[PDB]
Design a binder for this molecule. Structure first.
Ligand code: FBP
Ligand code: FBP
Ligand code: FBP
Ligand code: FBP
Ligand code: OA0
Ligand code: OA0
Ligand code: OA0
Ligand code: OA0
Ligand code: OXL
Ligand code: OXL
Ligand code: OXL
Ligand code: OXL
Ligand code: K
Ligand code: K
Ligand code: K
Ligand code: K
Ligand code: MG
Ligand code: MG
Ligand code: MG
Ligand code: MG
Lengths: 425, 425, 436, 422
C-alpha cells in the first residue's frame, strides 16, 4: 500500500544521496518500527520504589545502572532486589515479559594507577549478586580491562565488560581497549573535563564509528536530558543531542541524574524512547548498510555469513522482523552489527543472555521458559512460534508480514547457519 | 586459512579495488583463472561439426548448446544432427567426471508480416523432436513472440523462446519484446545490415544491460571469431570482441560459420572457452552486484529474497559454490541474475531444465536420477550431497570449503525460501 | 596515498595531520568518523557566523568590543522587548564599538545588525507593531530582518512591503516556527533571502521529539538552494548562569554546524546571562572544531550532483574556483563583489578555503556574514582611473589583509575570482596565484 | 532536442547499468570525433591524391613503418604527406595539422639495434614528430632511444610499444620515462596467450589514463577491410571498446598500408569512434579521474581541473586553450571533458603532436601579431572561436571556457574564463 511507503521516513530512505535524504525527512512520517536503541536508567532515590520501577519498565527502561560511586553494598543489594521484583512482576504473561539487565558502574581508580581495592570488593559483590554488565570506570589501557576481568574471577566469566573512556589516554589507546572489551561507554562527563569541552563530540563520533565497525556495543552517556532533573520538558539542545547520538550509531543511550535523583524519571525514559524512535527511522540505511558491508572483512564463520545474508534478505522484502534463536546472544549481535531496519527478535532460554543483548541495537529479547521438547526440530519450531506470537502481541508483526528466521543445524551455541523466509499466518 | 596465493588468483586484487579505474589498473595477466567457465558456448551444427566423433570433441572443448540453423537443410538432415548430438552426449553417461547435459536449440528461417508457413512446420518439428530452445528470427514486436508461443502446440509450452533482435523495429520495441520472451539474442549479422554498422555496439550494450536488469538470458552472436573459419588462430579484434561480450554481461556467446562449416570448429570452441574464463574473472563484481541490487525492485517472492541473501552470503565467505535444488530452473536463474562469483550448481530431476539452465550465466546443471526417498527431507539431503560429491569430483569443491545451499520448505516448484551455510566434509 | 603523496612531501606530514585532514581523505563516511582525532587541531578561520542577542548583559560599548573580539558577527535586536529608544541606543553602541577598530583597514571587522520582529500574535498576518518596527529598522539602517512566524509566501511579501522602497537592500530571513511554516517551506524559501529554524516555538507547535527532523530538512533544503540558514534557541542555555555548558549543548552546536547551518545563535546566553563573552567564545571554539570535521568529499560531490546545470557565468566560475581550491589545498578564495552574490555562490559549494570577499559596500560587507565561510573586507579607497588597475588594487588589498590576519602565508596558493566589466552580475574569471 | 542527442539520456543515468539501458541507436553524435586515427603509410596510401582523401576522411597521424622500405622510400612518403597536408593551408580557419610518426624495426634477437640508430637519426633529420619505439622492455630501452635522437631530437615524443611479457611486467617504469604507450597487440598476442591480451590492453589503458599520458590501441582493429569493403561485427566492436576503454588513439596497419579500402577503413574508424565517445559514462569517469589525480600546487594542473569542472557545469561547447608545447591542452585532456579542447598554438610541431591526446583539436595560429601581449592573447581566443564556428564546434549563444596564462612563455597557465559566444 501507498500508506506503508509514506511512514518510517521511507521516502527519505529511498534517496540517492545523503543531501536528498535530509531534504525528504518528514515530520508527518510516523515511526512504525519498535524503538531499537536501548535505554539505560541509573537507579537512585527517585527510581528505587518497586512501583516506580514497574512504571519505568513500561516506559522503556532496558538496563538498570547501579552507580557504585554512591551508597554502600547494602544499598545496592536492595536496589537489585527491587529491580528484580519489578521485572518479575510481569513474568506471569510470558508473551509480553521484558527482561531488564543490571549493570554495575564502578567507582574508579581515583589517584591510583589501576584497579582500586574498593573496585575489587565491588566487582566481587557484582558476581555474588549476579549482575549482567560492568561499566568499568576510567579505562586507560588493555591491562585495566584484564584487571577487571581477573577481579570478576572464574564465576564472572559471562559478565560483559563495557569500558568507560573518560580521559585523553583512553581515547588515544582506544583500539587496544576495544579489542579486549565487550563494548564501550563514551563517558562525556569526565571526558569533558579531561579534554577541551569543544572536542568531546569528535571523541564521541570517532568511538561510535569504530564500535560500529567492530560490531561491538557503544553507549552514549551524561547530561543527555539534564534539564529534566527539575523540568518536565527538555531543552532543544537536549532533544537534538539524543537524536544525534542515535543517528551517530549509538547502541544505547543513558540517563544519570534524570532517573537517579530527578523529579521526572519516568518522563525522562519516555522522552528518550520518543526521540530514539524518530531518529532510528531517519537513519540513511542505504549508505550505512553499504559502508558496513564494504568495511567488514571476509568471513569463514557460518554465523557471520548467515547474518549478512539474513540482513540482505530482510532489506529486500521489507521484513517486519528477523527472528533468531540464540544461547549466548552472539547470533543476535552479528545480525545487529549490519544495522537492519527489521527488528531482531532474539529467542533464548538464557535469562542472562536475554538481559545482556539489550546492549546491541535493534535486539528485542524474549525469554523462553518452557522445558525442551523431545524432538529438537519441534523445540526449535516452538521457539520460533513463541517469537511470532510475542511479536504479534507487542505490535511488531501482523498476518501477511514476511519475517526472516535464523537458526542452526544442531543444539548448542556456535552453530547458526540457516536463514528462512517465512510468511506470517 | 586460505593463503596469499588464493588472493593473487582469479583477479582478486582487481576485485577488491574501490573504483572501476583502479580495478582496470590492477588487472594482471599472471593472475590465473580458477573458477569454472560460466558463460555458455552455443555452437552451430553443420557439415564441419555433424559427425558423432567431431561432436564428442566439441563437448570436451566446452560446447553447451547445439544450434540447428533451419535456414538450411531438410527436416531429415536436422533430425540426424539431433540424433548425432544425443549420441555424442550420451557416450559420456558412464563417467560422472565427463557427462554434461547439452541443450538443443532450433534457430528459425524467419518471416511476410509474421509467422511463415515454414516456421510453423519447423517449430512443430522442434516440439516433436524435444528441442529445448527456439531462437526466433526477426522478432519485431510482442505479437511475433505470441505467434511463436502459439505454434509450440499443446506439448511445447516448456520450450524457451529467445527472441532474435535483428532490425531497427526490434531495437525500438525491445521492452515489449523482452517482457514476453524468455531471453534475447543480439543477432549482429542482420542488425549490422539493417542499422549502421557503427551503431551495433550500442544496441548490443543496451540489450545486454536491459536483459541483466530483467534477469533474463542474453546471447551475443555472429562473427565473434570469424577468421577462424579458415585460420587456426583468431585476430586481436576477435579475442577482444569475445572478452567484451562477457564483460558487457552476456549469458551466452555463439559460433556460427566457425563451427558449422569452418576448418577449425573444435579450436573455435576452445578459444571461446579460454577467453570467457579470463573475462569472467575480470568482471568488477563490487560495482555490478551493488548496481543490480539497487536497480532490482523490492520483492515479496521468497525465491527472489532467498537468492539475494544467498549471493550476499557467497561473496562474504568466498564460497566455492551455491548448490540449489530446482525443478524448473527458476531458483538457479534468480541466483544467476545477481552475478555471483561462486558457481551455481543446480541439482534437478528434469532433464529439460538441466539442458535449459545453460542459458543462465554461471549455472552448472547436474541431472539427478535416483528414485525418490519416502521421507522428503532425506531426498533433499541426498540431492545436496549429490551436488557436493559432484563438485568434489569436478574440482569445484574440497573438504574445508564453504558452500551456500538453497532449498525450499516443501516439495514442488515455487517454494524456495531457505539458505544454509555448509562446511564441506 | 598516491593521490596525496607529492603534496604530503611538499607541505609536510604535520600539515596533513591538522584540520581533520586524515578524516577528510576517507573513502566512506564510516571511515571518516573512525578517523576523527581530538589531537588534530583546527587551523582555518571560523566560518559559521555567530549571532548574539543584545540585551542588558551585552549593551555597553566596552562589553560589545569584547564580544566583537570574541567572534560576534551579527548583533540581534529582539523587538519582543524594549522600546524604539532602547533599540536605537543598542544600535548606536554596536556601531561605536565596531567603528573603534576602523583605524586599521587591513584588520577591520564588519558587524551586521539584525531586527527580530515581535510577530503576528493571534492575528492572521503582519501586525501593526511589526509595521512600525520594520519602518524603524529601515530608518536606522538595519541589515537584516528575522521575520517571526512566517507561514506562507504572502507573509514575506507583507514584510517586504512594510520595508518600503528605501528598504529593498535589507535581507529577509524567515523564521519557521510552526507546522504550517514547515509544510509550506518550499514556497517560503523561494521568496525569502534565508531561513531561521526557530526551535523554541517550533518545539511547542510540533512534538518536541520531531524538531530535529524539521531542523535537518530545512538546513538540507537551504544548502541545496544556496540560501543562508540559521540554527537558533537554547544552544548553550545553561551558560546563562554557568561558566561551562552541558555535554548536550556542545553536541547541539557541533551538530548544527555539521548539519550545514550558515549561522548559529545565542539568545539569553548573551542578552541577559552572566557569561555573554564566554558564550560567544564557546560557540567560536565548537564551530571551528565542527567545520574541520565536515566530510567535504561527500558534501561537495552531493552539492554538484544535486545542483542543476547552469548557464550563469558567476555560478560556473564559482564551482570551478571551489574545485581548484580543493585541488591545491588553497588557503583562500579572494572574490570581488558589489552585492555579496559572487561570494554567496562560492559559499554554497562549501569550500574548506576561506572566501575573502572584497567590497566597497559597507552594507554588503555586513550582510555576507549570513553565508558560511565568507570573510568580508571593506575597501575604502577611491576608484583608480583605469578599471583594470582598480581591480588589481582590490585583489592586492585582499592578499595584504589575508597575510596580516594569518589567512595567507608566502608560498600559499590562492584562487582569485573577478569579472570582465564593472557592475554587479559579471563575475566570470578564476585565477590561480602564488603568494610571494 | 539538445538533451536527446549525444547519448545525453544515458549520460544522466545514476548507475553504469542504467547508463547501458539508456543507450540509444537514434541518439546522434554531435561533438567532433576526439580519438585520433593513426594510418600506416604504404603502397595503398602513398600518393598525394590518396593522402588528401585520407586527411579528409580523418587521418590525424601518418605512421611510417621502418620494418619495410628504404630511407629513400620513407623520405618520399614524408614529402607526399607534407604536400597533401599543405594543400589545405590556404584556408587557415579549417587547416588540419597531421603528425608524422616513425615506427622502428626493433631489436630483433639483440637493446637498441644499429639499424634503429640510423633510422632514428633519419627521423630527426626529416623532422618527424613521434617515435613508436618497438619492443620496449625496460626504462633503459627508452633512454637508449632518447640518446639516439640526440640534442636535435629533444622535442620528439617517444611512445613505447609494449609487445611482450617483460614490457607488461615492467610497465610502470617504462611509462614513467615515456611520453606515452602503444598496446602492440600483434606481437603481444604471440608473446603471451592470445586470450590474455584484453587484460594487458585494459590495464595499460587504465594506467595511462591515471598518469595523464597518451595510449594507442593497435593491430587488426579492422583487419578484414584489407580485402573487404565492410568490417566484421567483432572489428566494429573492437574499435568501439578501445575508445570506451580510454584509448587516446586508434591505429590502422595493413588496412591503410596495403589494403584495397584505405580511405573506407579511416572513415569506419571515424564513424565508430564518434559513436563510442558519446557512449562514455562521463559521470563516473570524471569522478574517478578527479578522485585519483593527485593534489597539486602546479597552477596549470589546478586551472585544468577547474576548467573541466566549469565546462561540465554549463555543458560548454568547447574549452579554448593557448599552448606553446601542448602541455596545458594535455592537462585538460587527462580529465576527459565532453567539451572539445581547442588548442591554439604557434608551434607547428606542438599542433601535430597534440593529436596524441584525446579531445584536443589543434589550431595552428598564422595571423599577424599584435603589439600589446593582452591584445595578441585576445586575438588567439577569437581565432579559436572563429575556427570553432566554421568547423561546427561552436554556435552563437554557446558557452565556452577559455584557458590562458598571466605572462608569455610556456608554464604560466593560471586563468580560466567563462565566455558567451557572440
Ligand atoms: O547465538 P549462539 O549463542 O551461537 O546460539 C545459536 C544456537 O541456537 C540454536 O539455534 C538452538 O540451539 P539450542 O536448541 O541448544 O537452544 C543452535 O542451532 C545455534 O547453534
Ligand atoms: O526452482 P524451482 O523450480 O522453483 O524448484 C525449487 C523447489 O525445489 C525444492 O527445493 C525441492 O523440491 P522437490 O523435492 O519437489 O524437488 C523445493 O523445496 C523448491 O520449491
Ligand atoms: O557579486 P556581484 O554583486 O555580482 O559583484 C561582482 C562584480 O564585481 C566586479 O569584480 C568588480 O566590479 P566593480 O569594479 O563595479 O566593483 C565585477 O567585474 C563583477 O561583476
Ligand atoms: O601549454 P604551455 O606550453 O605551458 O603554454 C601555455 C602558455 O601560453 C600562454 O597562454 C600564451 O603565451 P605566448 O604569448 O608566449 O604564446 C602563456 O600565458 C602560457 O604560459
Ligand atoms: O547515513 S550516513 O551516511 O550519515 C550519517 C549521518 C549522521 O548524522 C550520523 C551518522 C551517519 C552515518 C554513519 C555511518 O557509520 C555510515 O556508514 C553512514 C552514515
Ligand atoms: O563492472 S562495471 O562497473 O563495468 C563494466 C565494464 C564493462 O566493460 C562492461 C560492463 C560493465 C558493467 C556492467 C553492469 O551492468 C554494471 O552494473 C557494472 C559494470
Ligand atoms: O558529510 S556527509 O555525508 O554527512 C553528514 C553528517 C552529519 O552529521 C550531518 C550532515 C552531513 C552531510 C550533509 C550533506 O548535506 C551532505 O551532502 C553530506 C553530508
Ligand atoms: O564505468 S565507466 O564509465 O567508468 C570508467 C571510469 C574510469 O576512471 C576509467 C574507465 C571507465 C570505463 C571504461 C570502460 O571500458 C567501460 O565500459 C566503462 C567505464
Ligand atoms: O562516569 C560517567 O558516566 C561520566 O564521567 O560521564
Ligand atoms: O541470424 C543471425 O544469427 C544474425 O543475423 O546474426
Ligand atoms: O523566536 C525564536 O527565536 C524561537 O521561538 O526560537
Ligand atoms: O608492431 C606492432 O604494431 C605489433 O606488433 O602489433
Ligand atoms: K561510577
Ligand atoms: K536461421
Ligand atoms: K522576537
Ligand atoms: K615497425
Ligand atoms: Mg565518569
Ligand atoms: Mg539473422
Ligand atoms: Mg519565536
Ligand atoms: Mg611489433
Amino acid at each position: 500500500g501507498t500508506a506503508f511507503f509514506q511512514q518510517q521516513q521511507l521516502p527519505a530512505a529511498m534517496a540517492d544521496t545523503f543531501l536528498e535524504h535530509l531534504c525528504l525527512l518528514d515530520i508527518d512520517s510516523e515511526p512504525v518500527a519498535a524503538r531499537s536503541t536501548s535505554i539505560i536508567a541509573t537507579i537512585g532515590p527517585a527510581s528505587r520504589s518497586v512501583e516506580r520501577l514497574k512504571e519505568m519498565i513500561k516506559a522503556g527502561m532496558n538496563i538498570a545502572r547501579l552507580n557504585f560511586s554512591h551508597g554502600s553494598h547494602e544499598y545496592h543489594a536492595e536496589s537489585i532486589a527491587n529491580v528484580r521484583e519489578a521485572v518479575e512482576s510481569f513474568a506471569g504473561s510470558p508473551l509480553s515479559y521484558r527482561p531488564v539487565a543490571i549493570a554495575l558502574d564502578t567507582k574508579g581508580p581515583g589517584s591510583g594507577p589501576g584497579l582500586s581495592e574498593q573496585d575489587v570488593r565491588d566487582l566481587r559483590f557484582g558476581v555474588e549478586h549476579g549482575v549482567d554488565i560492568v561499566f568499568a570506570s576510567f579505562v586507560r589501557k588493555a591491562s585495566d580491562v584484564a584487571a577487571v576481568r581477573a577481579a570478576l574471577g572464574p564465576e564472572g566469566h559471562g559478565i560483559k565488560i563495557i569500558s568507560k573512556i573518560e580521559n585523553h589516554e583512553g581515547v588515544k589507546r582506544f583500539d587496544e581497549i576495544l579489542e579486549v572489551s565487550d563494548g564501550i561507554m563514551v563517558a562525556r562527563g569526565d571526558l569533558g573535563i579531561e579534554i577541551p569541552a569543544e572536542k568531546v563530540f569528535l571523541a564521541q563520533k570517532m568511538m561510535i564509528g569504530r564500535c560500529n565497525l567492530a560490531g561491538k556495543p557503544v553507549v552514549c552517556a551524561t547530561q543527555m536530558l539534564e534539564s529534566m532533573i527539575t523540568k518536565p520538558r527538555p531543552t532543544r539542545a537536549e532533544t537534538s543531542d539524543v537524536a544525534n547520538a542515535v543517528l551517530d550509531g549509538a547502541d544505547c543511550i543513558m540517563l544519570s541524574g534524570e532517573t537517579a535523583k530527578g523529579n521526572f524519571p519516568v518522563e525522562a525514559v519516555k522522552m528518550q524512547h520518543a526521540i530514539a524512535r524518530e531518529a532510528e527511522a531517519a537513519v540513511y540505511h542505504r549508505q550505512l548498510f553499504e559502508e558496513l558491508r564494504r568495511a567488514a572483512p571476509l568471513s569463514r564463520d557460518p554465523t557471520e555469513v548467515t547474518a549478512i545474508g539474513a540482513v540482505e534478505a530482510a532489506f529486500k522484502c521489507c521484513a517486519a522482523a528477523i527472528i533468531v534463536l540464540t544461547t549466548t546472544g552472539r547470533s543476535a549481535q552479528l545480525l545487529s552489527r549490519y544495522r537492519p531496519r527489521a527488528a531482531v527478535i532474539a529467542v533464548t532460554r538464557s535469562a542472562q543472555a536475554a538481559r545482556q543483548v539489550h546492549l546491541c541495537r535493534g535486539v528485542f529479547p524474549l525469554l523462553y521458559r518452557e522445558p525442551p521438547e523431545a524432538i529438537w526440530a519441534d523445540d526449535v519450531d516452538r521457539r520460533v512460534q513463541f517469537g511470532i506470537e510475542s511479536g504479534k502481541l507487542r505490535g511488531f508483526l501482523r498476518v501477511g508480514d514476511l519475517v526472516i528466521v535464523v537458526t542452526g543445524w544442531r543444539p548448542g551455541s556456535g552453530y547458526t547457519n540457516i536463514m528462512r523466509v517465512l510468511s506470517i499466518s
